[PDB]
Design a protein around this nucleic acid. Structure first.
Lengths: 125, 178, 80, 90
RNA sequence: ACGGCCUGGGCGACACACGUGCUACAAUGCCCACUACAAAGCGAUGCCACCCGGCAACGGGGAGCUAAUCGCAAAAAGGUGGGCCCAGUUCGGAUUGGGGUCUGCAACCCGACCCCAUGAAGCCGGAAUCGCUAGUAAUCGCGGAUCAGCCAUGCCGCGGU
RNA sequence: GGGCGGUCGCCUCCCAAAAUGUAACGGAGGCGCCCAAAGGUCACCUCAAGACGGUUGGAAAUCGUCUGUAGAGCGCAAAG
């Protein structure tokens, strides 16, 4: 469904194709169908440009998201990383910034996954 | 004619409307164009790049020859007739109607695209700015496609003085850093 | 993310002192011992200094640092 | 790989290098052992050293109580070595 | 004074070694609809039916409860069909910014919980090693205890099978 | 000087003494080829190198440009 940026979901029903995009979820998948009076049990390719227009206008009329939000992907944290932010802090440090630990259960940012030399003499349990 | 005319009688008199010049051909013309790209033979030791060669002619047909840089490396790569380049001469009148797919398309996409070039310019009518890795075209599958451009565009215009280098290149088309 | 509905906690056992800098006169550098308080527009852009538990830290609320619970800017941990 | 603890003294680079040097030397013994742990104690009669190692084929244990702190540690690992010897049997 | 009142800070850090446990590699599953089933306790300053907002997390009027006689809970898994066809998959879900609730004159550190986006290791994992002789192991769920609050994947108890 | 070692043919000169113009246990680079084509004909193109900022582009490889006693290169020393 090439209608915006690298969006080409296809070869199935449309209901699926909906959420089947980096930005669409639930309140955006079938919820949009309603606002456009379309049944979920439809084909994607079949929808000629005619149907595509409804999406090209109504659907494409989204806020800063997916294909356009590519201008705030980091900005969403640009104002809470450097600065003396905890997240820095966890920002200045680019570590998880939302109530949790750092030793473990946050290995997303701090340390990728590469096996660290495990502690030897200091209870590992 | 079309743009050529909105270039022969539109963005041609304006210059004299601002401040003339000793000639009715004094105004800058379509000096040089070309395109420039070719990020060196990446995919394969020169044998799969062909699937990135013809990809240069991914808008029209005019069999580019890739050229070569200068053989002296023997570090990175480079030999007696390697690629590393581009160029190709394809100006003309349709080249005007080619701005139709230039001074138009692209802008409607290219990431956070808002304006075109922040001053910079000067010296010549060849302001070096352009492309990333986006075509903005669907006139073929674009699924079977799988390359990665990069580089920019040059196109000179016989506009030495800044107030020519980037003067006409303002009321020139419309898509630009406003 | 973080929240409290309303009434963002602001250490007021010191607010009276922090507001002295803007009640009849001005002055720089005041002492502090906290990391819970929140800052309000009324008192921004002033030389401050708070503690950690055993350590002291440099403080100065500016536009670039939304004056919140504060502690979320200089916890305590230290390593290498 | 090598953890040494004690509730009386501290871990010095010498005691670490001593035991550590013996680990790298125990090549013929190198086969399993996953995150070993050694503890050091002390009694009015001398010093004691205990060690525990977990392996994919079981667990080994060793202890020492020589009057000399260093001797005990050396003796303990001696049992580690002597223990692995019986593991291969003959 | 290795006596004493206090605000904060480490124990939710770090190049790391594995144990203990939870949850997954799926198609047996993703989700839509309805529904037949277990023990057990506990709710005195304590718990929740109903009323309406409401994406809910949630709220306010406060009935009722010291009780086979009101609640905690329309148990979960499951069952019939529906749509989904093997790709790193509507798997799993660590995970990051912007917002919300409940405890606290407060939740940076260091809260679980509701939404928006979100999404890795991973197609059984070199060795090595554990449990049980029956209702077993195994899979899916519930309460109690403590705790003012809050983050039970821990603890004790019980069951659908 | 014996002589182990080292020397035994061709080619670049330094020193050879501005025509030719020698030596040397005085010194430095090599070889006894290449190529159906770097051979013959006709044609166009000045090379390294800096700067202008733009690509996978933490120099450098891409391109436009002026400069360029042209500092490239023309099959491997050297002079011309």
């Amino acid at each position: 469904a090439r209608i915006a940026g690298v969006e080409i979901p296809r070869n199935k029903r449309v209901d699926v194709a909906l959420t089947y995009i980096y930005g669409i979820g639930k309140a955006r998948a079938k919820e949009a169908l309603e606002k456009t009076g379309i049944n979920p049990a439809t084909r994607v390719k079949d929808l000629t440009e005619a149907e595509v227009v409804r999406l090209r206008e109504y659907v494409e009329n989204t806020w800063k998201l997916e294909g356009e939000l590519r201008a705030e992907v980091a900005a969403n944290i640009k104002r809470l990383m450097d600065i003396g932010c905890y997240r820095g802090l966890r920002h200045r440090r680019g570590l998880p910034v939302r109530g949790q630990r750092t030793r473990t259960n946050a290995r997303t940012r701090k340390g990728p996954r590469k096996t660290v030399a495990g502690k030897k003499k200091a209870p590992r349990k | 004619q079309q743009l050529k005319t909105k270039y022969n009688d539109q963005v041609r008199p304006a210059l004299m409307q601002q401040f003339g010049y000793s000639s009715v051909m004094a105004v800058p013309r379509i000096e040089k164009i070309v395109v420039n790209e070719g990020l060196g033979s990446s995919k394969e030791d020169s044998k799969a790049i062909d699937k990135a060669a013809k990809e240069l002619a991914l808008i029209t047909l005019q069999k580019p020859i890739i050229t070569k840089a200068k053989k002296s490396i023997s570090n990175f790569k480079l030999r007696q007739g390697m690629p590393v380049g581009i160029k190709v001469t394809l100006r003309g009148e349709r080249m005007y109607v080619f701005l139709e797919k230039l001074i138009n398309i692209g802008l409607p996409r290219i990431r956070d695209f808002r304006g075109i070039n922040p001053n910079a310019f000067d010296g010549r009518g060849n302001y070096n700015l352009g492309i990333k890795e986006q075509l903005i075209f669907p006139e073929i599958t674009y699924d079977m496609v799988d390359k990665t451009r990069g580089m920019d565009i040059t196109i000179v215009t016989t506009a030495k003085t800044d107030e020519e280098a980037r003067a006409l290149l303002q009321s020139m088309g419309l898509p630009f850093r406003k | 993310p973080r929240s409290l509905k309303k009434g963002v906690f602001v250490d007021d056992h010191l607010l009276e002192k922090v507001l002295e800098l803007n009640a009849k006169g001005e002055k720089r550098l005041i002492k502090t011992w906290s990391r819970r308080s929140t800052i309000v527009p009324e008192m921004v852009g002033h030389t401050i200094a708070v503690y950690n538990g055993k350590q002291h830290v440099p403080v100065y609320i500016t536009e670039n640092m939304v004056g919140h619970k504060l502690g979320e800017f200089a916890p305590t941990r230290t390593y290498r | 790989t090598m953890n040494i603890t004690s509730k009386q003294m501290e871990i010095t680079p010498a005691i670490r290098q001593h035991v550590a040097d013996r680990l790298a030397k125990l090549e013929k013994w190198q086969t399993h052992l996953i995150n070993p742990h050694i503890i050091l104690s002390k009694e009015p009669q001398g010093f004691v050293a205990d060690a525990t190692i977990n392996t994919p084929n079981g667990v080994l244990v060793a202890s020492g109580k020589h009057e000399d702190m260093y001797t005990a540690i050396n003796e303990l690992i001696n049992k580690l070595e002597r223990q692995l010897n019986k593991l291969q049997h003959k």
